[PDB]
Amino acid sequence: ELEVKNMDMKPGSTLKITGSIADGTDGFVINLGQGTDKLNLHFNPRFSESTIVCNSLDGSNWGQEQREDHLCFSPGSEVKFTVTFESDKFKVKLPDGHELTFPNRLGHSHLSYLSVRGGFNMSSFKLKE
Amino acid sequence: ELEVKNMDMKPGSTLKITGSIADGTDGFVINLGQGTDKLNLHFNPRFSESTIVCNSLDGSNWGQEQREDHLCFSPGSEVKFTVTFESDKFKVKLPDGHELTFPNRLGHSHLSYLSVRGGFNMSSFKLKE
Ligand SMILES: OC[C@H]1O[C@@H](O[C@H]2[C@H](O)[C@@H](O)[C@H](O)O[C@@H]2CO)[C@H](O)[C@@H](O)[C@H]1O
Ligand SMILES: OC[C@H]1O[C@@H](O[C@H]2[C@H](O)[C@@H](O)[C@H](O)O[C@@H]2CO)[C@H](O)[C@@H](O)[C@H]1O
Questions:
Q1: Cβ–Cβ of B124/A127 closer than 8 Å?
Q2: What total number of domains does chain B contain?
């Protein structure tokens, strides 16, 4: 339920998130955007469905749902995701090395809100230039 | 206006902040507390007065002000602060190992709100128990 607010994530920067995935959890959520009603990227690993459902949020309506069946990490372990923001798109680097890519459909050249929902408890985040 | 809402900082754990002091600023603030109304530790380095002002704020009530002139850093530099929360006091470890201490006046055994004002651009946040 943690929520970082008013950060300055410009294009080219890299956000490094390390946290722990609660035992026996269905999944979790990492939201990046301008605010709660505007999520440029909604990274959501569903252990239940065995997928990483990524999607965007523009107020009330979600965008087309994209899915990646490359859930190669487990609960009980503390892992790290490295998502690098780029005007054109985001590249999330999964803990097992596999890079993902989600489009910046909302045209936002600046992120400022992050929120950790679900069974993930992040111990630290690092914003690189 | 940067604010980390919803953290789970209990006594014993340690927050480890890192950032850049904006060139030309007169100071910056790091608030640790229950919210905007309740601040258990208001950490404020004044380059304009060359001290570090520490105080507590119970909604409207600002406690007795503490001033520590061990302000051995300047703007344009990257500093590191380590805040250990003992339920009885806050111990702030300055960039140069010098340790400060501020009594937990509001008697809380949990901190869930961080906020940064002033000319400090935060790059790291690590919280571990
Ligand atoms: O799209 C991300 C969004 O999905 C919601 O659930 C979807 C579900 O993934 C989809 O298969 C179904 O058709 O619609 C549901 C929404 O009504 C989640 O509830 C939400 O948290 C996001 O993860
Ligand atoms: O106690 C922290 C608190 O300080 C206020 O500033 C004081 C200042 O310390 C004092 O020298 C001056 O005489 O009065 C000011 C206002 O009462 C800040 O206004 C407040 O934001 C905190 O930083």
A1: yes
A2: 1
Cα–Cα distance measured from residue B27 to residue B39, given in angstroms and rounded to the nearest whole number = 18
Residue B25 is part of a domain; what is its CATH number?
A: 2.60.120.200
Contact A126 B124 (CB under 8 A): yes
Q: How far apart are CA A113 and CA A129, in angstroms?
A: 17
Q: Is the minimum distance from the CB of B62 to ligand 2 under 6 angstroms? A: yes
Q: Give the type of residue at A19.
A: G
The structure tokens listed for B57 are 């704020």
HSE on the CB side for A44, CA within 13 Å? 20
Quoted resolution (Å): 2.9
Residues 31 through 90 of chain A touching chain B, CB cutoff 8 Å: none
Residue A65 CA: nearest ligand 1 atom is 1
d(CA B74, CA B27): 9
A53 in ligand 1 pocket by Cβ < 6 Å? yes
Contact at CB, A4 and B1, closer than 8 angstroms: no
A126 and chain B: CB distance < 8 Å anywhere? Answer: yes
Q: In whole angstroms, how large is the CA radius of gyration of chain B?
A: 13
User: Residue B18: which domain range?
Assistant: 1-129
CB atoms within 10 A of CB B62: 12
Distance CA A15, CA A129 (A): 9
CA dihedral B28, A80, A42, A33 (to 10 degrees): 20
